[PDB]
Symmetry: D2
Subunit: 244 residues, 4 copies
């Protein structure tokens, strides 16, 4: 049980890496606490909890209230998984909307920074913790016509080494996983997986020649939450089949 | 004359790398057009122009009007130097203000993206151009207690490879210079240079053992504007004495 | 059991990351096969096997014979851990010996390439495998007066993305772990750990403020050997407490 | 004249970036001294000198003698351009010859290190200098079936930040230019340029959609030799049309 007795809070669990991460963390023995904007609704909480028995859906959805509630459940949080996702909008220079660029930055850089400000103080008092940004490999290569999206992922990735330095003396590590080409609801959803021509083009440009599994991304994030990853910090770990 | 007959537009010329860049571009034969928020004022225009004879201070200060005016002067712009600077505020997690994080992103990522959207179309029609972001090396190492600043510089740097891809078929290059420890009014001003103890600590952590000259940063930016740098694109060039 | 039923071959097991890796791999359920130049001697084999019950010390020490023997034991190898270490000799330009530079390259780049050439064909036929170079973070920052050492580690790291591409279609991943400041017999041995002044200087320059454990390096390597790391390839994972 | 009164020594001038660099350095006012293995022959010296009037072909071909002679010509060397090239042999794991891997490392890492050991002491005494490795972008992406070549270029690149640190206090900078897809006799020769199908495949994978000019590589190297690049050190500058 690699995460035996670790309390992991995963944000926006209905998006991006939430399910993979919940699934693996539970299989590795974690206590999982999950936030989602939908979790003010009992039926959404019930559906998550019935799919992932042992995971707890938090009924507070706003940041400060959600953290206070997460902390009340067991008294502490061992790892924060900041699972943040805004749509990658096709946005050539000539059509890109500045308001969408600001919204991408809000979701992918300002919001996870806020959550870190809320959770970090409890970790410091413990002298232990893990903060994992679930992010994108895209800034490592760049993507024509998606520069606002890539730039906002870069802003996210660009918190990591500074926060690592700032929290490292309290033994808390800070890392990101730079995902790409992983089956997920935000970027590689089922409709895309069923487009044979899209898939042929995509997999021809990945060294492993396939898309990644949400369980692979989950296992990566889980590994960075574990005790065994305690000497890794400040890092953005590419998880894109060799594409970066 | 490495920039003989090149029209270079430098933004926010009273900040950061503006003066170094003006000075070297003129010495290398360029026609320099300069924007600054102060340039709605005749005396500010007159002071710039008297310090840098041959440089033209543009009297429009808002982006769209400033670009239209810059373009009217000679009919074209060969290089855009996006010279963007917001204060690096000491901002530990516990004190950082979210509104300052948003403002940093506005100044250092959204504003230069906007300016690029305004200038790029004229270059495309020419099939030639240069876009240089004047940015920071800080994201290459990270800085404790300045993560909002570093993250916003990372967002800036994170436009570069995506825009390079998007504009490369029209032969326009897109690069950034990742400055640090360069004498300049924003980050390394005279007051700091006169603090002997600050300077001893700073230069002990730079491999070249000294701060950089605004003429060195200017010469770097000028080089990326030149014809000889036409096969360099998508790159963030560290200019920090070996610190990154 | 994250490595349940995986056959892991670890080279030069008496050096560098061998013991940490053996220890964690066994705790995670692996079958461990170990090479060492000392293992032509029965007593050395007996000492390893008594310290790590369930690990098998191979009695062939030369590459081709050692691989043929490793493969005979169970019929296959799921992961190769190329655990390679040559001394980091203090070698300023003026004193560096060219023959030592060649020897460093032999040990840290040519030898692991050879071992990969020997093991890879068996993996290809299976369409599964893992190759992990145990390497150094030093090339990510550079070190004055040790450039031959750093350069040879860079050569090692510089196999990874090319081999990843070459073997990725057969689903085999290729990665490196860029260690530094990890308690180990080659670079951070007990004598160094007992030098209070050395330790104070070292830990002042690591963000986590401490040296890493051989179990942390072992757990990292084990993670890259696991099924859960199947979408990570071509990567050099820094494992140096934030130092890179 | 950006390199007015600078003495530049370019090695192996008949290969790779030699001609581009000679041509631009002379146009920018440099005094060029050139080494080549062919320059023990008067007619080869005469042919270089007649093609590049003002450049001096050195008649000593072995390292120590060649340096002593270069230094005698004017008393000093302001910049060393280590222009090193060994063939990129197609070498899948199953066919790669270990002796060719060693030879690649000899030519691309050990030889330029040797030349640096020979030239550096004269610079230190002056407190000024420039060392530029002419290298490859290939390690920044990796190339299937060429891993020995890529690895040896990585070893080369892997000298740069360590030597930069070691020589930076004497104000000497050390950088590399990571070329790829530049017309040159070693890697992109005329025969390749005339293969329409090869060229279509190559340029489809470069963001600028074309090969680079030997004058562009030369201008890059010249820029790093100049006074204006005095705050750049420890860097590997990609020069590959956006490919890295």
């Amino acid at each position: 049980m690699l995460l035996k007795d670790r309390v992991i809070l995963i944000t926006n669990v209905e998006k991006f890496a939430g399910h993979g991460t919940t699934r693996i963390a539970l299989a590795q023995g974690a206590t999982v606490l999950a936030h989602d904007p939908s979790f003010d609704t009992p039926s959404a909480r019930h559906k998550y909890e019935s799919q992932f028995p042992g995971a707890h859906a938090l009924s507070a959805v706003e940041p400060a209230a959600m953290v206070e509630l997460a902390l009340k459940r067991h008294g502490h949080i061992d790892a924060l998984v900041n699972n943040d996702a805004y749509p990658a909008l096709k946005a050539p220079l000539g059509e890109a909307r500045i308001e969408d660029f600001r919204d991408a930055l809000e979701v992918m850089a300002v919001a996870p920074f806020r959550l870190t400000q809320l959770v970090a103080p409890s970790m410091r008092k413990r002298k232990s913790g893990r903060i994992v940004f679930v992010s994108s490999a895209a800034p490592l290569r760049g993507i024509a016509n998606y520069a606002p999206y890539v730039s906002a992922r870069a802003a996210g990735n660009g918190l990591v080494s500074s926060l690592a330095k700032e929290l490292g003396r309290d033994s808390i590590t800070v890392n990101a996983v730079g995902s790409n080409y992983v089956e997920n609801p935000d970027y590689f959803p089922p409709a895309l997986l069923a487009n044979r021509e899209a898939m042929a083009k995509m997999t021809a440009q990945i060294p492993l020649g396939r898309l990644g599994k949400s369980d692979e991304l989950g296992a990566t994030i889980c590994f960075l939450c574990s005790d065994g990853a305690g000497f890794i910090t400040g890092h953005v770990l590419p998880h894109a089949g060799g594409w970066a």
